[PDB]
Write a protein that binds this ligand. Structure first.
Ligand SMILES: [Zn+2]
Ligand SMILES: [Zn+2]
Ligand SMILES: [Zn+2]
Ligand SMILES: [Zn+2]
Lengths: 146, 146
């Protein structure tokens, strides 16, 4: 019982080295500090739901998800998806230290790690589409399995 | 130290409810019995590598991977990818109880679970492309977080 609470913080951040699909949906499990990230072409309610569907398969179901006031997170579409899963949801103005400083620090570590790995294979600007998925999985791996 | 060994068994299995991308690459971690699955349009060396790239981000790096004698698993492409990662590889004739009974039992539980969930949303034959990914992530979730 007395071991910690399953609460996530999720946000989208922009990363042009991953273009065309340059919207990265990033989720930090505030307990374990495990990071889940996925690639998306557009930030929509459906992009938020598909991401969380992946994160649940990976981390398991959380009790609550903390996001900001973004529409993709407050639409009726998403409110219904979360309800369908029984996951509480609490908003917070963009970046609100309370619920966003972690996922924001995450954004940075992630983009840094994407740059290091990309430049190491000699990709200085955009990563070729066919290597994006493998490069993102490696970054995610490096950041979680420390 | 005296806690168990990180050895995987991987195989592809065919699932037409997931068409066009109906080749499911399935990996069982023989220690934890955790299951990783991904969708692929064609069974190729590159389909095996992309899958394992996902599984590593999810489960961490294994010491060895057991497959059968399939070409996608013995090509020079894959031998080099595995070497690049430092993961030993041991083959076994298709299905060889030794290294395949687990991933074969996995194949069945997975396809059963895909059928149950699909028919529950009223998809009796093929699952609509736009719901495949979410349905597969749920099946994977059900089978791992028991
Ligand atoms: Zn999507
Ligand atoms: Zn926002
Ligand atoms: Zn692929
Ligand atoms: Zn085979």
């Amino acid at each position: 019982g007395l071991g910690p609470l399953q609460i996530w913080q999720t946000n989208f951040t922009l990363e042009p080295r991953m273009a065309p699909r340059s919207w990265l949906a990033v989720t930090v499990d505030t307990a374990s500090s495990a990071i889940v990230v996925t690639q998306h072409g557009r930030v929509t309610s459906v992009a938020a739901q598909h991401h969380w569907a992946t994160a649940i398969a990976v981390l398991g179901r959380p009790k609550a998800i903390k996001t900001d006031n973004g529409s993709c997170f407050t639409s009726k579409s998403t409110r219904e998806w979360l309800a369908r899963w029984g996951i509480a949801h609490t908003t917070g103005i963009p970046g609100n230290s309370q619920g966003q400083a972690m996922v924001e620090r995450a954004n940075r570590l992630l983009k840094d790690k994407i740059r290091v790995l990309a430049e190491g294979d000699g990709f200085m600007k955009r990563i070729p589409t066919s290597k994006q998925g493998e490069l993102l999985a490696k970054a995610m791996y490096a950041l979680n399995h420390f």
